[model samples]
Each structure stands twice: as C-alpha cells, then as structure tokens.
Target chain A: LRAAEHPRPDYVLLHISDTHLIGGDRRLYGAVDADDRLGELLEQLNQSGLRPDAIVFTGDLADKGEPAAYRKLRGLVEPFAAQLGAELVWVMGNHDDRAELRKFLLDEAPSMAPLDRVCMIDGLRIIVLDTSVPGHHHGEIRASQLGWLAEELATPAPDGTILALHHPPIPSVLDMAVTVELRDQAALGRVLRGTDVRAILAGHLHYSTNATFVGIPVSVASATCYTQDLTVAAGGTRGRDGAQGCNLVHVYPDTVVHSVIPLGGGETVGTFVSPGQARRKIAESGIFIEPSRRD
Target chain B: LRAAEHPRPDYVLLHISDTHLIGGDRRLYGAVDADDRLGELLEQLNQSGLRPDAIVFTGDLADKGEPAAYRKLRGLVEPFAAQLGAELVWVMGNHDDRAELRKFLLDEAPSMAPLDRVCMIDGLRIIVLDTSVPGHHHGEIRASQLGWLAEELATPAPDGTILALHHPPIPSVLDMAVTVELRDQAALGRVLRGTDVRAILAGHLHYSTNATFVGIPVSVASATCYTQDLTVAAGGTRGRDGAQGCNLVHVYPDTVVHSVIPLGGGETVGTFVSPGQARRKIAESGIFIEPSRRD
Candidate 1:
C-alpha cells in the first residue's frame, strides 16, 4: 500500500559497486566469504519490502580478473536481477576481464565497442562510461573514450544528462590510491564544462562519496562486497576490508538524493531510530514530569 | 571593525560549552593535559580576529569537577571575555563544584536561586536555565524548576522568550549518553507546549545537535575544545572526537538561522578540493588545449 501510495517516480537507480567477488575459498580481509556475503545481501533485499526501478553494477565484478570469479558472480546476481524485475547495467572495472566478463556474467554480444553508452531514463539522459584498464587497479578513460564522450555531450538533452562512470573525475585525497586519478581530467572537464549534465554517478572507491565536479554533483556509491577506509593513515589498501553496502539513488526532475545503505549483517548496520522515542522516554521518566496531585 | 560597522546586538549570549578542561597531569582517554589542548583552543580564539557579543559557558567546564579546576577555568575564559567585550555567564555541569563554581568562576551572589532567569537580548527575551545536578551527567529539570519556568513564561515581555539551557530537551540518539533525560520532561513539555518560546539553545554533547522539542527548534552548538565521536554503534560512550566546530546563530524577529562553522585547523576535515580548484587544475592540465593554441 505504501509503495502504491508513494508510486515509484520516473526512475530509481540502485547502485552496487566494486563487489570484488571472490571464490568461496577466498575471504575479504582474512574473514567473511564474498560470495556468501553477497548472497546474504540479496536475501536482505528480498525482505527489505522495497524495490528499485533498475540496478547499475559499476565495475570490479571479479577480484583477480579471473574467469571463474565472473562465473560465480553471474550465478549470484542473475537470480536477483530476474526477481526484482529490473534491468542490470554493467560498467567494466580494471579488475574485470572484458571478453570473459561479457561472456559469462553479462551474456552481451562480443564487440570492441566503446565502454561508454548513452541511455534515456524517464526522459533523462544517462551517459555511462567505462574507466577500466585491464591488469591495472588504476582507472582512466582512453583518448577514444574521451572523444566519444565529447560527441555524446555535444548536444544537450532536453531533460539534462547524468554522466555515469566507474571512476571519479575529481581527485579524492581520502581515496588517494585506487582512483583513476583521471589522466586526462582536463579533457573530460572541458567536455562537461557548461553542459546541462545534472549529476555524475560513479563507483570505484568502495565508499560513498559526494562532491561537485565541473559544476555537476558527482556521487560515488560504496561497494557491495566490502568498504574502503575513509582515512588516509589507515594504510595499505584499507577500504576493501569491511562488510559492504549499496546506494539507493532517487532522481527527481531537479535534484538527486543518494542514500548509502549497508548490507550483510553480523550486527545491524545503519538503522536510524527516530528522535521521538527518546523524547517520549525523557518526558515519562519523571525526571522532567511532575508527580500527580494524589501523590 | 566588524563590531563597529553595526552596533552590537543587545545582550549577545556567547554560548560556549563542553570544554572538558583537564589539568596538566591528568589524562583524557590516554591523552595527557587536555587543559593544554583547551588552552590552545582559547589562544586560537584570542587570535580569531572576531569577537562575540557575550559569553555563556554552558556546561562540562571541567573533566572531574574540581574546585581548583573551576578557578583555572576562570583564568582561561576571563581574558577572552574581556577581549570580546562580553560578559561571561556560567551554567553548572555534572563535572562542576556548585559552591566553588559560583564563588570563583561565576562571581555571583551564592543562592539556590531559580536556575531560570530572564534577560533581554536586543529586544528578545532570553530565558537562561541551569539544567545541571550535583554528580549526574544526565540532565533533568526538577518540578520546582518547571514551576519556575511556567512563571517565567507567564511574565510579560515585548519580545518572545528564547529558553537557554545547558541540556537540550530533545532526544539525541547520536550522543545518547548525556541526553537531558529530564525527570520532569513531560511537565516541562506541557509548559512549552503552547508557550511563546521562540527557540532553545543548549550544549553538553560536544557535537552540533538539532531537533524540535515540543515544536520549538533546539540548536545545540558543538564544543569549543573537543568534539563527540559520532558512530553508528548502539549505546556507545565515545567522546572528544568527530568535528570541532561551533554554531553561528543569526536571530531575527520571527526566525533563527544556525550555521555550523568548523573551528580553525578543522575546516578542511571532510572537504576535498572545491569545484573552483578542480576547474583550475583541469584547465592547467592542457589536455583540452589545441596544438597551436597559446595563452
């Protein structure tokens, strides 16, 4: 009833990124199986009582750029994709093997296509760019990708465009190590400059990050396998060591609100209780209330 | 010069709290001499170049509530009071010596006077209240205090009253440990339910807290010395962490705007490079400039 009353708007993008999907024998941070954790996450979503319009998987589908890992990932995500009645859009990451990833996981026809494409979602243009360099953890949009981006963005969409990529355009001191650090960021910025790109959505950091880049709000969703440490001194590839989460993106005509929700449960993560409970508790505690006249 | 540009607002209450002052030998969570840290804070304010209208030390003046410590507090704060051309108002805390605090720190006539007092701040009725008890960190408003508050609300004033208390009436789940937990909260709520109270200013949690209590907006400023560690853990007791900041409250005739500004040195804590800096960096990268182009 609530879902009907609050009918899904034009489009809601569920962003799950950097799964770093490993085999059962492989563990994240020496503990917790990636596949088991992803399975449990899907189970929780089944019980969350809410659904998304579409799902975007932004890169790092496999841990070691392994074919076996992609096979494992296909089994885990395909069922949930079918159940949710949602379309799954995949953007390649440095950790993914392009040909094998397409064959086993995505089942898309083999083509040396530009990893970037434009799609219209509920009257809004969504430009998805692939920022992967095979065998390298760092990301970059090749010269060809940049040219394609310019051509796609040459004409503004009527409802504005939302640029999506696997790497952030801005340099994040917080996530200093694994960022694409965008080699030709100036070219990318020039392509986006003065454009009606409402926002940019990307994932690579494995932590939810938001910042404005080239007059557009860029949102980086956290991973679904583990989280990256948000501090610099935590040291030595730290972010991919925690539980994992997803982002629910609500796109309105004017603004987009991205909420980070953690998945996988040992302890309940990210449960927000309202302020009223404590307010009522304090009011009834007699510390602030007066005694009855009879008393 | 800024003060001279506009006449100082009548009775500017410089609300300060949660200093958590410690002696040179004492340790707070393994860090030695929290007093020196606090002293450094005061020194920074002395150099801040901006002066407040009046100063109100809300609560948590000392770590262990020592008499000699309150004396030290007087020495530390008095100079800033003089520099800002403001009068210092001291409210009691869990870690405070009532008699010694009133005698040395406050220099006020000793009496169990009503914790609630009314003064005019630039034609605005300011009601100051002491929400502290002897040795308890949790705050409460006694029945007698509530009666006194009701009477104060009944008293006539041209401007509506803004209640200033050390403890916020709202429930702060973020800093759940030292919430007002008022014993007579319902009675107090009843008094504020239909009253003309404009807003409530409070401190104690060391972090900026905001919530509505009985329809009145409660703005809790962050501590001047330290900050509260904001974690998602339930029933957690972490302290002296998170962001060190304060509130800039703009009071108008019918509304109030509270802006949170990080104290010096902590301004760039969560921020990366701004949009302007990113653009400049991109332009200088020369990735987009034509081969023959020159500046």
Candidate 2:
C-alpha cells in the first residue's frame, strides 16, 4: 500500500475528455463547429508549458461515429501527445464506434474482451475499464467484466490501483443531463468493496465534480466540448457560458490532489496587457512617491 | 523572529499593482481597444471568492498618467475596495501627476515625503517603498529614501519584515527589459544586508520573477494587465497572451508560497466533453457485440 514497495512515478497526468470531434460537415451544439473548438483547445495546450506523462481521451472521439472524423482526430492529437510527453489512451464512449475508433485512433484489431487495460505509473496501477453498453445512453459492467476486474485486483502488483472508466458508477447530483446513474450499480460496488482500488476516475459530467461513491473517491473531469449547463435547476437545461478547462492530478502515496485549470480562447470581452506596460504607466505618474526620511 | 512577538497585531495585505486601466479612447499596443479589459478585471475581483485584509495599489493606476483617467480610476476602485472588505492604499507612479493624482485619487493634500509607509500584517512588518522617479521611465530609491530604509531596519521589529515596492531592486535575468538598474542600487542593497527582512515583494516586470537581493528573497508578482513576452533569450519586446492573471501568496512562519492563477473568461477548446459524455456516447453508438459464443 506504500510507495516504497511499489514503483513511484514523478510524472504528472493530464486528463482530457469529451472531445466530441465531429465531421467537417457537422456543427457543435447545433451551431458552433466542434472542430473549431477542438482546434482552440489544441492551441491552448500547445502554449500551456506543461508536458504531461500521459493524456487520456475518455471518449466521444467522434460526434457521429464517423471514420473520417476519427482520422482527423488522430492527426490533431498525435502532435499534441508528442509535445506533452504523453501517450494517448483511448476509452470508448457512447458516441464512438469501437471498431472504427480502433482502426483510426488505436490502429489495432477490435477485440470483444472487456476493453480492459492496465498501466503502471510510479507506484500506481491505472486500470481502465470499458463500461459501454451498446445502443443505449447508460452504462453496465457485465458479470464477466466484473470477474476480470477481480482477477486483475487479485494479481499482486506493486502499485495501488485506480479504476478509470467513461461511465462513473455513481450519480452526478449537479449535472442531471449526463449523470450515469449506472445500471447494475450494486453489482459494481460489490466488486470494489475489498479491492486495492484507491479511487475511481470517470468522465461524463461536462464539469469538474467530486463525490464518494461506494466508499471510493470518484472524480469526474469536465469536458472541452460544449459543457452541459451547470446552472440547470430542477428539470431545466444547464447554462453554456462557462469557460472550458482541464484538470491536473497530482498523486501522492497517501493522497491525490486535483487542480482545475481553465483554458483560453473565446469571445474577447477585454484586451490583454503586460506587467511591464503597467509599471511604465505608474512610473510616469508623479504621484508615485518614495519615503524622504529614515525612521 | 516569529509573528507573535511583534509590537503591532497581525493582518492581511492585498497588494495589487500595475493595473494600466486603458480608457475608451486609448488602444493597447496601438491596436486593440481596452475599455472592457479593466472592467473585466474589476468584475473578477468583485466576484473573487476571497476577501483581503488591506488593498495596496503599488502604481500605474492609469494608462498614460492622465488627470481625467485618475478620476475614473478612483471611481472604479473606491467602491470595489469597500465591497471586497479591504481598505485602499494608493501609491504614486511615473504616469501619475503627484498634484492631480493626490487631489482626485487619494483626496489628500500634497506632501513631499516619500510614498513609503510601514504597517504590520499578522505581526509581520510590511514596509512599502515608493521607487518611482519623476519624468523618467526607470526607477530609483533616492539617498533620502535609503536613509529612511536604514533606520527602519536598524530598529528591528520582533517579527520579520517584508519590503514592498513598485520597482524591483535586483535584476531579474528573465526580465532585462524592465530592470530598474536602480539609481541607488548599492545603497539600498547595503541597507537590506543588515535587516531582518525575510522577503521583498515587488512588481514592474510584467511576468512573475524571483531572485535574491542582499540575501532577501525578492518576488515580482505578475500584473493583472497583459503579460510581457516570455522568452529564455536575453531581450525582446514580445508579449505573452492569455487571460490576465494574478498571484496568491500564502505566507508561513519561515517561507512564503506564491501561486499564479489565470483569471476566468475565455473560449473553450478541444473536447469540452466529460467522461460521462464519452460513456453515454459509447452506449449510444450501438457498437457493442456481446461476448461472442466463440469466446
């Protein structure tokens, strides 16, 4: 359970999700183009100066599950991952077709096996799970998938394990529109009760959110696409004016800290000025005075 | 010296400097207009979740040190300071006219004394020095000002002291463009060498820079205005673009930590989608094939 017995990582993880890359012909939120938004995000990342250890794309690789869109997405992300010192890990989302996504993004054969993959970083085990249930806008972990999860947990590894999935097995109290309200929630909890799973990483809520689910810490990363209205009260729709942002996770042996960073690029409500310019103006003002006599 | 033994009680000081408020008539960098920029920054502070103990404006309250501008600056900042739970302390800058600025902005009779003043924050001695020289773009801490500084440091407070000034004394290798190359640099350094001043807080360099001046840690906070162009190479006049940001200082008994946070407002890029969106998208894609009979 301690880092001394496991491989400890000194690298940082940048989690990016909900990049719903639509085809060139499609529009985002019925008006804004998804590609334009994605382009802005890529530019921001290029300028952010943070080189992440790994970049995880939680899903919705395409707006319409189109092959051409995935190809385009591949082109956009490849250079970005390289610049950030990150390896891209694709998690299939409901809007993504696994076969097409694998062909274009992963460049691998599609397998029926539970889309399960494990990565070890520093002294932590990142276990990515596939919770997608085809043709539905809900999630379920099959009995066989749960069994596979148990075996993975049972097999001794040096690092503590973290389960990463597109669907959180918990409900999002704030975001009603995209809350998982996981199907077979009880069954999923049954599997995690006695495991080495330290936390659950999920993507779904288009906003950064936190909660304890089935006794495990669950963090829902916000999306870069158009965010779901966060101000939707009751059954009303959420507001779409919130700035785009990302989360940086700092994992320690005993704790994990998540810092949310908002991205740049949008309507210019104001002009940008530099610190030196400000100083120059103040220096020119004669009112700026210095102490004349000593204490 | 610890905070508890100081003569004056401990308090919080909100140091804000180099806000070059551009008017509806002026443009930034000879191109972009900036009426909304200052307002946006004001709105941000108005809505900022934290309340400071005291507000200190280091310098450059106006864009060009105009008489009419100071009135507007006072109009905007006065009410906001009251709302944010901070008492306002204004300093003179090169762009500000001592007489007019004092008449309108400070509402005080003109005095020849150095703008330098001392206060205690949570038992920590804070000495604010005005380094702005008249009719010149560079800064200087005059002989008389140095004399005052020496005396202030000679009689040591039980608690450690921090010197806040509009111009930085030491050369920040990263910011060669704005280095004061102080007129009385050696004199100021000599005074600081004998003091129990733990750190020196300053602004002028449009970027966040750090160095040690006379054995004291000198931190130059970033401006609320635009940022100077950041390059590893020695000198250039390029500016970095992004949301205007600010620094948050967390002071401890022995050390101080400064965190640079970008102000909110900008465009969303990449996939604004969340893991939940990805999961739902995967489910909705209708791409799943149940574990095959062959398996």
Candidate 3:
C-alpha cells in the first residue's frame, strides 16, 4: 500500500550486466542483437521513476574485447548515467580487454594488469574486483588482489561496502557454467568474513539468481543481451533472445532489497484497479500502521 | 526486446506466502491488518496479466492457527482460484494446526499428523511437506517423512516436480532468523541429491531471497502482511509495512524464472517510449534474428 509518508531509501544502486556488445553489426551468436537489447533496457530504467545513486555494469561490456565495442559501450552508457546524474561503475569480464577498456571507455593510459577500482558515493564504498583471467573464460582472484582487498576492508566505510565482480562466488544451476565459476572462493570468503561488505553484485550466467557467501548476500543480475533458454534440448548452455532482464538494488541502513526487472515481453492481461483506486482501497481497508507492533 | 513470437513457459505458479490471517477484527501484533493485507494481495493477483497453473500459500495461513481464521482464509482464497480455474494449495506454518487446517481450510477429517499431500496439475507434480513442529518456531523433517518423500521421488513426473515447505532449508541474512532455521538439513539433502525436484518454494523470513539446496534452486517468497524493516535500529528482527511483495514463478522445460513483484509503492516518473513505439524501434534497428548463430 502507498504510504502517506514513505521512508526514503538511504541509497539506490542499479545493476546492469552481460551486455556482450560486439564491435560490428553482427548479432551475438547471430540471434541476439546486443546493442538493440541494451538500448531497450536503458529506456526502461530511464522511465522507471527511480533515481539511483550509482549505476554499475558487472562485466561483459564487450563480447570479444573489441576496442570499437568498448567505444560503443561508452557512448551508449556514459550519457545515460550523466542524464540520471548517477555515478557509473564498470567491472572487468573475461570477454573484456583491460587495455582497450581503459583507453577507449575510460580515456586513461592502457595497461595489461588487473582492472580493479574503488568508488565512493556519500561515504558508501564500492570495490570492483577484476576476476578476469587472460585468455580464459574461468575467473580467479589473485593473492595480490586479496591482499589489496583485505587492506581496503580493514577500514570500514561510514555507510558500509558493496563488492562487485564478474564471476560470482556462487555456483550456477547449469552444468556448463560450473566450469567457469570463480576460483579461490574460500580465499575471497576469508577476507570478507569479518568485513563490512553488505552485498555482492555480479553477473556472468545470463540468468538472475541469488545466494550467500561468507554470510553476505550475492545478487546475480540477468543479462541485457540474451538469457539462458532452458527449453532448448541440450546438456550445455543455450541462449535465447527472450526473457532478458536487469536488477534494481535498494539499499537502506542495514538491509538491501534486490529485485529482478524483466525487460519487454508480457502484456497487461487484465486491469482490475488503478493506482489511485488501489491506494484508496488499502487506506480504507482498516490496516493502519502501528509502529510499535511486534509478533 | 519483445519477440515476434515469444516462447511460452511450460508452467506458471503463483507463490503467496505468510498471509498470517487472523479471525475477527484484530490486527496482528496490533499493527499488521492480516485480513486486509491478504485481500489486497488477492485482488492484485486476480487482476495480474499472467495466468498461473497453481496458486500456493506457503504456510502461515492463520496467524495463531485459529479455526475461524482458517475458514476465513479458505473463503478468501478458494473462490479466487476457482474463478481462474487454477489449482489451490495450502501449506502448514509453525503457527498452523494440522487438525484445524483439515477441519476448516480442507474439508477432511481432523488429524495432528503431518499434513503432507501431492497435487498433480497436467503432469506437473507439487508435493507439500509439513515442516512445522508442534509449538516451536524452528522446523524439522522426520525420518518417516523422508522415507515417504524418497518413495514419492522414485518415479519422476512428466513435467518434473516442485517441493513446497514453510521454513526454507537455506539460512537468512538476518541474525535472529538463523536460530529458527530448518534443523537436520543434511538428512533432507541426502535424499534430494538426485531427485527430479526442479525447484523448491518456501517462505518464513517475510523477505524474498534465493539460494540452492542439494544443488536445486530454492525460491523464498516474501510475506503478504508486513516485511522486515531494515532501517530500524536493532540487532534483532524488525518489520515495517512499506516493502510488501509476492513472487511469480515461470517454469520452462529446463529452467525456472523467479520474479518478485512489490504490491504497492512509487509513481511513474518519466515517459520514454510506448510499447508500439518500442517495438518499431527494435525492428527498425537493423538487427534481424538468425536462428543458427552460436559463439
């Protein structure tokens, strides 16, 4: 029910993942139009009436680590964040090139090392880890990176922290996805055990799911390009152009709400009540708020 | 993006949990109007564009296991399912009485034994298990019940199976909820390791989340009455009436999609593109579908 005075969220974050943008006009795996799909999702968020503090892309910005693709991605995403007046975050994916990403998208000096970063929005810490392994699809968090992370978590931020990475520490239901999961998860868990990390955002599997790691919440956003088609007859992973989606993260003082927003598809089958009518019904239903009530 | 011909889902299930309905005009904990809240939710489902094959109340149908509350719950829910021509499923909560549920909600003989039953909808099997232990907040599965479950899983349904329970096998992010988790999870895992349980549906924490149990996907639906209020200062559990929601389960041949729909809140902020306009833009973007493409 609509409240007369709504409790404002402390912070809001938008999670968009797995664009898999290609340089040329070729469809991803020939069926999914990555660029077109991403545009549709951006329009949905733009009109969603949500004002996010930050917008983070959890890897796979480019399908083949193409320089031109990174430029295209920058052109597509940078202005949207600017229009929303929100901070932009980008993580490294196995299909992304650190050198190309920094040069074309970030307008920085090109380097081949891990592309890790830290962003602060109103004392809230967001640490983006580069789990991408060069020349491989599988992910790994290096010993050196863990050391850096431990140092970062040693001093907790005023509003706590949110860890963003490409390969999620949790396993996938698909058989083929298990092969490319994050390696040395226990090491990452060890560092995050006593840290102030409230939530971990990730995306690699084209589907959205959630789990816990080291007692922290893990939210995997679905892909903007395509989704895993379970109906396809296969023992391996199959992609479909339908069921594409993204996630919206609402962060309060101590709790975080992760909701999956499916892009396109499905029509309004029946209309029973309007927003104003529904609100009035709830108000008239005799369910008044009593703040001190507890079961 | 919207497809020319969408791939239809194999089965659709609506997960309505923790109604917490109370008899008479008393509000729960003197705050949550359980009856009114449940009525609003039913209206929302009744008007939703999607059609479900089965509608399940994942426990807590009655707040105090009151006989009158069960009757009220039945009168409110039974007709909604009947109008939709969908199957109705009732689950037992820690606050529910097996005898009272049978006597009132279900037109059957009253008994204190575990209220376990199976509902087959067009070859898709749904097995409801009574995990509520007498008067305790914690949950457990007896050895005999496991034997019964194992025997039921011996033969797979044509469309696979979905296991429904009150307390989830996974732990919650909240501190106090861990004390009331499902005990002896390993024994249940041992039996479900290789079963045809496509998904597990549960509710208790009053918040929506997802996890895996025995390598199977677990979907935990949020409550209808009130939700955990994270903004409140506490080392224990706190709930507020703002962020209330439910879940919609889309089951395909090999994959299941879980979506959380917040009942009421927010307003439309911006207007971008209409459905017709968006469809035209996607089609005119020069991205054509080529069925044989794979990476």
Candidate 4:
C-alpha cells in the first residue's frame, strides 16, 4: 500500500502540466498534435525512469504566448533537464505570454509581473506561486505575493515547502471549470497561515484533482496537452487529446506521495518503481513498427 | 457543486466512528450489535435531516470501556445533543476508557490525561487531538498536544481549524492496520507546520481513506458498529459487520466538503446536489408493519 509510508524520498517533484507548447506542425484545439505531443512526451520521459529532482511547468508555458513558443520549449526541455540534472520549473498560464515569458523564460527584462520564483531542488524548497491575474482568466494571488509568501515562509525548509502554482484550489468538476477557478482562495488560504507548506502544486484541472488548501495538500497536475474528459457531454467542449498526463511528487519525511503519470493512453503499465519509477509506465503512441529503416 | 464553494456552512461536522459500544445488548466481534446498533442509530439519526452543528464521535468510543458503556452513549447522544442544540464532540479511542471516559463522557473527575479539547462551533474551531496511547493500540500526539495545537492555530479562524483526531495519517492499507498506525507521524506533521489546518477529521481505519498530512486534508471517518471489509479475502482476519457510515463535514468560507454518509450500505447510492444544497435527509430502515390498535 504505497510501500508503508516512510524511509525515503527526499526530493522527486516532476509534475509537468498543460504544455500547450505551440510551435512546429501545430494543431491544439483544432484537433491535437501540439508538436507531435511534445515529442511523444520527451520520448516517453526519456524512456521512463522517473528521475525528477525538479521539472515543473504548472502553467501553460505557451500555446499562444509564444517566443517561438518558448523556443520550441527551450529545445526539448533543456536537453532533458540537462540530462536529469533536472531543476527546470516555469509558471504563468492562461495561455501565457508574460511578455514572451520574461524574454525567453526568465532571461528577464519583461514587464507585467507575477512570475514569482524560488527553485532549490537538491536543496529541497519549490515555492513558485504566480497565479496570474493580469487581464485575467481567473486565478490570483498577488497582494505582493502574500508578502513574498510570508518572507519565504519565515525561515524553514529542510524539506518542507513546495507550493508551485497556476490556479487549482479545488472544485473543478468542470461545468466550464466553474468560471475560471482560484481567486483570492481565501487570500491564498491566508498566506498558508503557519508556513512550512509541504504540498500545493497545481495546473488548471486537466484533471488530477486533490484538495485542501490553507491547510496543505493540493496537488492537481494533469495536462501535458489534453485529457479533461470529465465525462464532459453537454453542449460541448470535450477533451482527451490522447489521455495525456504527469505528476510524480513523493517528498516523504512525513508524507506527500502523488503519482498519476499517463503520458500516452491505453493503461495497465505499472513498472517504474524507483529511480525511473514511470508511475505505472503506461503505454501508447502505439505502432512498434520501425522496420523500414535503411541500415 | 458543494454550493459553488461556499455560500455558508458555518459548522456542520457530524462524523461518527467505530462505535464499538459493547453495552446493553452488546455483541461486538461476536458479530456486531453495538447496543442494537446504537438503538438503530438513534432511530436513524432522529429520522435524518442533517441538522448537526456538532456531533463528533471519531474514536472507537467503546467496545468495552464501559461506565455502563459511556452510560449507553450518554442516553442516546445527550438527548440528540439536546434535541439539536448540537455540540457534543468526543475523542479517545484505542478502545476508550479514560477512566470511564472521564466519568461517563466528560462529567469529569477522571485522569490519565490526553483527552484534549476545544470547541466553538460558531466562530469555528474544533481542534480535539488526544490520540490515546497508554497501553497503546497505536496512535499519538502528546508533545503537549503540539503546544496546544500551536496555540490554537495562533489566531485566524473565521472558519479554518477542524483538526479532530483518532489515528490517521495514511498507509494502513490494512495488514491488520499496520501494527496499530499513527505514531510520531512526522511529529504530527511538525505541529502542522504553518497551522490553520482546515481539513483533518479522522478515525481508525474502520475503512475510508483520504490523505495528505502535515500540509492538510486528512478526512478518514467510516465506521459505526461494523464495516471493515476492505474487500477482504487476502490473508484472512476479515470484516463487514454492516458496512456502516458517517461524515458530512461541509464548513465553507474556504472549503471543507467531505460528505460520506451511508450509514447502511451496499455501496453506491448517490445524489446530493449543492450549488443546490442537499444533504441531511435520509430514510431507509424498512419493515414497519402494524395491525389493529385499540385505544
């Protein structure tokens, strides 16, 4: 049962969310393809081994907010997070464009603020928090980033904090995602009251849903480009462009776990139990046929 | 959906748990009958309509901690919490008996400590924590009740703190409930880190499991007489006395939802709208046949 709880997992974040990376051979809402589904999800997360000391996204990162769509997703997720040296997070959504995502993803010199950061992978902490509202699509949290998240959680992080964000406070049972979700969320749950966060990660409901905020444990993660068929069926908006997915988490000194993967469809994959724990190595993008190659 | 998040639910908490009651016509492990199932669950919660502003039980609440088994559960839950004036929480568990549950459920004058308390119902705040452990059955939380739950969450409860407890942090996916679960629990999740805890009601695993701890959201609650058949048939030591139930939290003003009130189950029996308020109205205990009456 989730391997008895404690004993390890000091890092493991991984959570990709709502890719929307609209670059080459684009297609998105006109019927899938978003860059061959982000190169078959980084060639199945580099043939799945689940390493993720850090590799967020948590926001759109661009479907329309392109700077060559964030340089074709910083050329394949920065060489597979610098080949697993991992630690490559990003945040703004609502189809992003924070002035070309701060000139090529935080190269700075952009304007409209709210892309709050924080980093620290091997060192632990992950705070992110932008909740973009400017010309908004609903989702907020900028009362000066709650005094910079209470002065960076007023000191503390031996493996505690991990707030990343892009909406997600809870109740996203569709119906048009209840008019844009998270706003004030009781003032970002009153600046996470006593601090030491531990878990809040997000991604505008591509559907992974877990909740509890201001009291911790938020999670969300679910869109690496489509999969929200929450039994949609009504007037019409549908989803599921390849039952895609993400989210790995872990962080256990006192619990955090997550798990949801799915980056392609067809189920029952389950093997990725450590180091490359592909969260149930789910398969798809089918056709194991490469017999026409010239040697 | 859960009334668009919150349009009011000041206090609704009516969670019942493992009432192993063993009093009057007792029957516990001898095939359930917790006092004719607590008098047919107090005549089906006084003909259910859900008016609880407070009615917690959450712990084993007795299988044999008799003081006339908590004076027959204080004559049917203190006259139904004094005919719904509500407020009647309780906590102990590892098969209780804090010296006859503080002399017939808190009439006081008993000892061994760890029966912590806190109640406000209207200004919201429920706290509770005691995690019984003297002759242990596994459960804890007495580092001086984490500085009285961080000084009662250092102010800020327009509707936040719920915290109740009984033993639940996670991973008891049953193996005889992992040698009695809940100990240290990351030192009770580091005194609930930045506090303000808004979701954490609990109960021993009499089946029902939700999690996320040290960073909020816990839930649990599921038991009333009997119902631990976690699809048994694995290694024996089975369950299923009557698949009972309880838990209907609500607490809005910043989310808390919960809802799991079966009370007599066979699984699946939904419907409780709420952007269209609809809970607290159950009725099902058939066979009421009558014949001839001469007054």
- Each candidate's clash count: 16, 64, 0, 11
lDDT of 3 by residue, A85-196 (tens): 8999999999999999999989999999899889898778999999999898878999999999999899999888999999987645444554466766878989999788
Interface RMSDs of all predictions? Answer: 13.6, 14.2, 15.5, 19.5
Q: Please give, for residues A1-295, the per-residue lDDT of candidate 4 as tens digits.
A: 2233344355666788878877666477566666676677767666544456778889987878878878888887888888877778888878787878899876889888778878665557888888877676767777888888888888877767888888887654333454566655777677686788877888876755565666576777767666644222221224556446565666656677664544432211112123122122211211111111111
Q: Which DockQ values do the candidates obtain, in the order shown? A: 0.04, 0.03, 0.04, 0.02
Q: By lDDT, rank the candidates, best first.
A: 3, 4, 2, 1
| TM-score of each prediction | 0.48, 0.48, 0.57, 0.31
Off by over 4 Å in 1: A1-9, A23-25, A28-31, A111-113, A175-180, A231-237, A264-295, B1-295
Q: Report the error of model 1 at residue B189, Å.
A: 32
Predicted structure 3, TM vs. truth: 0.57
Residue range with the least summed lDDT across 10 consecutive positions in model 3 chain B: B286-295
User: Which candidate comes out best when scored by TM-score?
Assistant: 3
Instruction: Residues A80-134, candidate 1: write the lDDT tens digits.
Output: 8788777677778777777877777767765555467778755668787877776
RMSD, candidate 4, Å = 23.4
Residues B1-295, candidate 4: write the lDDT tens digits.
2223324344566778878786667367566666676566656655544466788887878876878878888887889778866788898888887878998878989898888888776577787887878777877777878887777787867666787778887654334454566766877777786777877878887655555765577777767666544323222223555435565665656567554443332111112123212121101211111111210
For model 2 the TM-score comes to 0.48
TM-score of chain A of each: 0.79, 0.80, 0.90, 0.30
Docking class of 3: incorrect
